[PDB]
Design a protein around this ligand. Structure first.
Ligand SMILES: Cc1cc2nc3c(=O)[nH]c(=O)nc-3n(C[C@H](O)[C@H](O)[C@H](O)COP(=O)(O)OP(=O)(O)OC[C@H]3O[C@@H](n4cnc5c(N)ncnc54)[C@H](O)[C@@H]3O)c2cc1C
Ligand SMILES: Cc1cc2nc3c(=O)[nH]c(=O)nc-3n(C[C@H](O)[C@H](O)[C@H](O)COP(=O)(O)OP(=O)(O)OC[C@H]3O[C@@H](n4cnc5c(N)ncnc54)[C@H](O)[C@@H]3O)c2cc1C
Ligand SMILES: Cc1cc2nc3c(=O)[nH]c(=O)nc-3n(C[C@H](O)[C@H](O)[C@H](O)COP(=O)(O)OP(=O)(O)OC[C@H]3O[C@@H](n4cnc5c(N)ncnc54)[C@H](O)[C@@H]3O)c2cc1C
Ligand SMILES: Cc1cc2nc3c(=O)[nH]c(=O)nc-3n(C[C@H](O)[C@H](O)[C@H](O)COP(=O)(O)OP(=O)(O)OC[C@H]3O[C@@H](n4cnc5c(N)ncnc54)[C@H](O)[C@@H]3O)c2cc1C
Ligand SMILES: N[C@@H](CCCC[NH3+])C(=O)O
Ligand SMILES: N[C@@H](CCCC[NH3+])C(=O)O
Lengths: 454, 454, 454, 454
């Protein structure tokens, strides 16, 4: 039973991981498993690797701003952080349930889709077992190249600088290898102005109740978007604020269901990463477009049906749609936001989305998705180590970015996780392949040491 | 297009119906249909029958105390008040939806089970078309035999006395024929005492909010029973009073699902009334017991699953069941109720139901079903017209009760509706056969007149 | 109760309909209903219109080549040929079931989706009531303009010439107004050669058993396509020929589910035809593309799941996919068909569909859809009556094609049905709006006469 | 990684298990797991126990006579032979799928209910890992008491005699402890005569095709019963013999659905065995009756719906039920079977089951369940070791039968498995608690040795 011990800050690490979300957690789990002589017989002959995870949050949390009450996983629990790699792992969802005394009780639900609350707790339970090698409240701000021989022209380590979120102090740690697994940042439409009453979906549960404190007051609340987050928020607002008037604004004509049909869904199989990666740029782009309805701007059928039913019940009570407490406004775009008025309410102007009315609202929830380019800011000072004229980070199949072999030692490298959809497929940003990917990553990074034991 | 005109109070009626609930409404609809030359070609040759319906409520309503938000019909909309007799009828659910401008919208729900709110409105829409022949706010208090020749020993009419619910005045109407369609009365366990805080399920929506006025207060509310009403209330309380502590008390070990499987469910077919009626007393009793799970002490599967899921989510948050906000207490019976205390809360003592704890609650909802014997109080003064030594009303196949042929003229009679489960089957008290039964009833009562036209 | 009587062949008709499929049948039903004084009170004052339907089949049939055993409707039974226009109509699906003694039995299925076999019989039952005004075994071959004054330059009638399918004789009928409701013709890929062993899906049930007579023989049968017809055939072959080796060839990567989600599905509402028609050419094209997954190249989820399950069971028995009895070959196109060999089997050559193997098969089923341009062949001799320079038939909102007002009298006209997707929407070729459309069509064609009664 | 080695026939065993079905297999798995130092840290200090399993079949098989094509498990795969005891076990269903290369593929089915074919293979894969300690083709015929000191009056071992199914030779093995896990024997109604054409459901797949060799011939085949086996066979016959005329005979009025609702289903939780066992004889009997619909004379809802649908399709084709190819004959009992006729068909006489027709059939399938009393025949010679006057085997909570402490040494004992419903609950004969029970059994039998290591 291996327990990963901490490395002193001042020592050269074998690996430093930026972020301790699901993607990094799955690597921590895979490494534990690779070192467990109960699962990997060769691990009897294997000194502990010097590893550290840096996480900006104060403790493990999973999209806490969107832990909407009643919200469910959109993925089978079998695709947890260990099972698809090894069902014998102690880090499986079912083993978690066993450890909690809930296994028989979950079984009686006959569901593959746990509440997001439950799956977060599963990952929290997993994450707590690595507390000795994780530094929370640490926001990585840059990765700097290092040379053990400064007079040479070869880079063989990296310095990772992080800011303490409480004290603001900068700490440095040196490592041979870096993983960047920082997820995404809130995507806001460029046309919207900054305002406390305009809030991205990622901050829904955490910041909206601070703005609208009275759950009984008749607030007007708009929601922009038509994907899963938009539908979840729109539906939740009606429960959370029973006397409110909610409006869903979308440029599309309707909410559309996610495609989870079994043949299409095979694009998410771990085996398929090889097939997707080995295609051309054009084929990968075309494939992404063809399968878009599996993940992007789509809503789970069950939720669409529930919302539609709520709308129909409003029709039963009142045939005049303009008098409905909760409304959906399709094929529309925001053209102007008035937010300097002495009123508590902003004034939102709407036009057709085809190439109209005015709304007075207390808050606008913006469910417009994420960008996954934040790693570029962290890596700006290592850009010069890329091969000449390359202005994009190119991840290999094993997620290690390409660098000039004559500038960077074979012992040093940087891996990207969760931002590689374009090269690795639609499963990249999701939970789908994390168990298997974690195992691949451990092989890629710690292969040499693991072979000496093997 | 026939429109039933009112009969003056002082005139001898052909028919007087006690109650204007679903059962009487289906008779009104069938009579309209029988007189509609568009549906019944013979009706061209057919004077209007002198008819009146007496209803104690101020206006049409359908189990208003149990119009729980979100509650659904447990029966296909095809089994409405007309369709199974004639799909061409203007009183079909689909024609109602067409008249309302909702037909296409309902179609898009892909559901056979409308909200109870919607189905009530359907029946209200139907009922409003008979407002000229219905006297609301009139509670029938007795049915008295009458003799057009008082010196004779033959009864040939009945006087129906009703009390105005507002003024308390007694009005009489004389009729040749009487229908009693008064549904059921609240069944309370004999062991429980009378108290404003102890309320039958039938009075849930109408009287509980008057008792517990603050929807935010942390009330303790118990629910007794394990049938559909108990589950509906238990589930609704958690929505209506978010900070409340609810407890479901049942003598059974678990909530059990209603059987709606297709072969068993055929007992509800209109054709099957003939088969059920023609069996012996023992066979009818045995059949009722064998099929009990179709109607009695059962909960719709979907609702059991929802409640169970809510319970599991409580387990996720807290593994200690005694700390759960909402609890179910199986295999238990109330033995004592303390309700004279200076406290606002009653003290409910519990023991095992096999041949324990104490609860402090602000209200006890009692979901213990209905009796259907209230017609006996109304008919006590006509009992002597039954054949000698008969101490039970015996309905024929056509629902007309047996009377001594030498005491009662062939032109006079009394019909029972909705209280005949023992002779007619499990569909008797339900909506299942009302369309067809209404048609049979019109034939039984108005056959002679309808034949002259035929 | 109106019964449409036949018009002698030699008389000038008010209307002549080409085709007696669902679209023409819905017009016949609407006309009956408009003339029924039981449904339309004004019809008491209304001489019978002189009408005739010409149908090339020997008797009413509905896609008989695709009456696959077990195949189901993809549309709610509420969207039958009358209900959405008038639920009181005797031509509703529910009234049909009542007339058949099956209403209670269908109700117990709890399904909105009847077997295609059942829905065909419903339409057959409807169609048989118009046998006096339908000429079967008559294939319309041309529509010719006529002038009651031949020296004038104004057209005021049309001659319809039809070929007797048995005798080959040409018959003519003259009418003021023509409806063309001829559905679609089999679409075959241009690259495939003509061969008795290459059969379009439309001829599956009728012609394939004549080719492959022994249901026990181990035939190799390929299926080309990935829409509903392809999946239905692929699945059925495995039942019909238990020892056969079936192959599904598709250029797409996977079978994709049809979108029947409630918000998107509203594009099929009758009310929406007005909204769709009133858009620009670009907006209509964009809208058609956006909603394509509702109808084109899609398979019902349930069927995809069944086929996938069958595939998984093959995996259980044998992990080597190349040995599977039934296989799916995605992302492939046929490049060559060898069919001159002394062998009973054709040789099908396959390549990637991205811009491989060889199959030896006894039959190739081609499920590649339909064209709806066959009306152009029938109307070639009336093209000159279109406004100058117009080389496309332009249907108005009411389906009447545009003609030069100075060449064609106001009393004469031609209507198109079922080929108008581009102007009227995705519901045009389907059953979705037929009841309502039939009513609109009767108003458009017989408005003048119906107003005199009104 | 422990591998159980064989014990020579002539050595005194620690344990001898009669039967190698699911129940014994779960004990073998639990013992392996208890000895696995990877799962049980104490097992590092633990000589191998001398164990042997005797199985009458030639190789592992699971109800092979009822491996009906398409038949599914009625239990969640989580309730496999290891998971509920330890999800880390290599004997879990998911680990089996991983070892087979099918884990991702099963995941994509979104089902908790594998095909019986698949679950048998899972158990076969498990069973093959114990081939060194299992003797197949050995039918145990008696258990005889033994005394290491024959002049003493204390029994301290047992001799198990088994017959080789091929050679007929009797072999003996001596053991301290015996487990009897022999499942059930076919229950036939006493009124039916012996005939090759009258076959119990347990022999359906294995022996019926030998009798009715021509799958195309129009055989008449009757099925008696109304539980899961009856429905499965009735449905399968229609597929297997497409031209046959099948009849389902039942004494009940209808097929009834199994209750798998979540609250009731908790009776199957492993924890609940303690609660059930600790009740009185009357309470246990009453509890068994109350929950009967979970297991006995019930059919999975989905299958009832399918069969009902098939019946409705027959109604569509022909409204005359007496002409239906496949029929159900409710509320009936067989009174006479004529089977001496020169005809190939037997003549079955039917009467009402309430306290009729004749059928001519080629075969009668009898789906009338199992008895679980066969252990009494094997134990007749050890009956005298029970406490005085005890004429029933009384299993303790830990499944060890009560014996006179002064006649039987503490080191010797006999355990019963799968025949203990009356004392242990409805989960006893099923797969529900096998993983946990296997663990309890290993503790009960090998506790002393396992503690020395602990
Ligand atoms: C509301 C919601 C629901 C979802 N549901 C599902 C689902 O059901 N199934 C599914 O497959 N996928 C789902 N997803 C997709 C989601 O991306 C993955 O579940 C998962 O979060 C990916 O993990 P990650 O580690 O790549 O990114 P994240 O989960 O975002 O984790 C990245 C971590 O890095 C930390 N970090 C960021 N920047 C820094 C820095 N500079 N220094 C230090 N630490 C930093 C962040 O605090 C965060 O903890 C969902 C996404 C959202 C938003
Ligand atoms: C909450 C609830 C939900 C149900 N849901 C369903 C369902 O989904 N499907 C189904 O098939 N069945 C259902 N039922 C069964 C129900 O009995 C029938 O739907 C229906 O109410 C039977 O109609 P009825 O006219 O016989 O009785 P009621 O509906 O009770 O109508 C009787 C009427 O008589 C009036 N009345 C009583 N006494 C007098 C008097 N002395 N003088 C004058 N008027 C009087 C009453 O005010 C009432 O209006 C439900 C029952 C309940 C309580
Ligand atoms: C297998 C299949 C299943 C389908 N299922 C559904 C469904 O579930 N729901 C749905 O909404 N839609 C469905 N459709 C769409 C289908 O187009 C409509 O159901 C319907 O057939 C449209 O009717 P129509 O009259 O426009 O065309 P058709 O049904 O093709 O009828 C046209 C008629 O015109 C006749 N005809 C053609 N040419 C001539 C001529 N020269 N002279 C005389 N007569 C002629 C033909 O014989 C035919 O009877 C399905 C289509 C197919 C192929
Ligand atoms: C068709 C069918 C389907 C079922 N499906 C399910 C399901 O989905 N879920 C569920 O929980 N339960 C199910 N059951 C219940 C079933 O009892 C259990 O799944 C399981 O078979 C119990 O295992 P067992 O070892 O107690 O008995 P068995 O499975 O009968 O095994 C007993 C073994 O002992 C052997 N044996 C018998 N006598 C002797 C002898 N004298 N000498 C040597 N060997 C002997 C037999 O050959 C057999 O291999 C099903 C039962 C049947 C019949
Ligand atoms: N299942 C019954 C109705 C039961 C109603 C229970 N409240 C039917 O089909 O008519
Ligand atoms: N429902 C039971 C299994 C019943 C099996 C019936 N053959 C369980 O969950 O364990």
């Amino acid at each position: 039973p291996p327990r990963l011990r901490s490395t002193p800050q001042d020592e050269l690490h074998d690996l430093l991981c930026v972020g301790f979300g699901p993607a990094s957690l799955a690597i921590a789990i895979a490494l534990h498993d690779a070192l467990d002589p109960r699962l990997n017989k060769s691990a009897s002959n294997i000194a502990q690797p010097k590893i550290c995870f840096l996480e900006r949050q104060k403790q493990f949390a999973w999209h806490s701003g969107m832990l909407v009450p009643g919200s469910k996983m959109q993925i089978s629990f079998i695709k947890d952080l260990a099972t698809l790699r090894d069902p014998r792992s102690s880090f499986t969802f079912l083993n978690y349930l066993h450890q909690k005394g809930r296994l028989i009780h979950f079984t009686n639900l006959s569901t593959f889709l746990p509440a997001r609350l439950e799956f977060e707790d599963y990952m929290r339970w997993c994450a707590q077992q690595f507390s000795d090698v994780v530094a929370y409240g640490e926001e990585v701000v840059e990765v700097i190249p290092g040379k053990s021989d400064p007079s040479s022209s070869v880079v063989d380590f990296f310095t990772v600088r992080s800011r303490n979120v409480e004290t603001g102090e900068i700490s440095a740690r040196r490592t041979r290898k870096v993983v960047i697994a920082i997820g995404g940042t809130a995507k806001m439409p460029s046309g919207l102005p900054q305002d406390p009453r305009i809030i991205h979906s990622s901050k829904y549960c955490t910041t909206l109740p601070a703005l609208l404190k009275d759950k009984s007051k008749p607030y007007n609340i708009a929601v922009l978007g038509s994907g899963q987050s938009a539908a979840e928020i729109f539906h939740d607002l009606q429960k959370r604020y029973p006397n409110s008037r909610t409006t869903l604004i979308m440029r599309d004509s309707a909410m559309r269901p996610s495609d989870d049909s079994p043949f299409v869904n095979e694009i998410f199989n771990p085996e398929r990463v090889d097939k997707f990666y080995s295609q051309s740029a054009a084929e990968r782009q075309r494939s992404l477009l063809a399968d878009k309805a599996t993940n992007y701007s789509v809503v789970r059928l069950e939720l669409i049906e529930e919302i539609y039913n709520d709308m129909y019940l409003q029709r039963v009570k009142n045939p005049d749609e303009t008098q409905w407490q909760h409304r959906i406004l399709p094929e529309r775009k925001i053209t102007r936001v008035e937010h300097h008025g002495p009123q508590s309410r902003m004034r939102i102007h709407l036009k057709s989305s085809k190439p109209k009315e005015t709304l007075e609202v207390d808050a606008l929830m913006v469910a417009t998705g994420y960008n996954r380019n934040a790693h570029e800011r962290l890596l700006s000072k290592v850009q010069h180590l890329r091969p000449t004229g390359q202005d994009q980070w190119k991840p290999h199949r094993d997620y290690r970015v390409e660098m000039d072999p004559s500038k960077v030692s074979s012992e040093a490298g940087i891996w990207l996780q969760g931002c590689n959809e374009r090269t690795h497929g639609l499963s990249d940003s999701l939970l789908s392949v994390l168990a298997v990917r974690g195992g691949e990553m451990v092989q890629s990074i710690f292969g040499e040491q693991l072979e000496r034991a093997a």
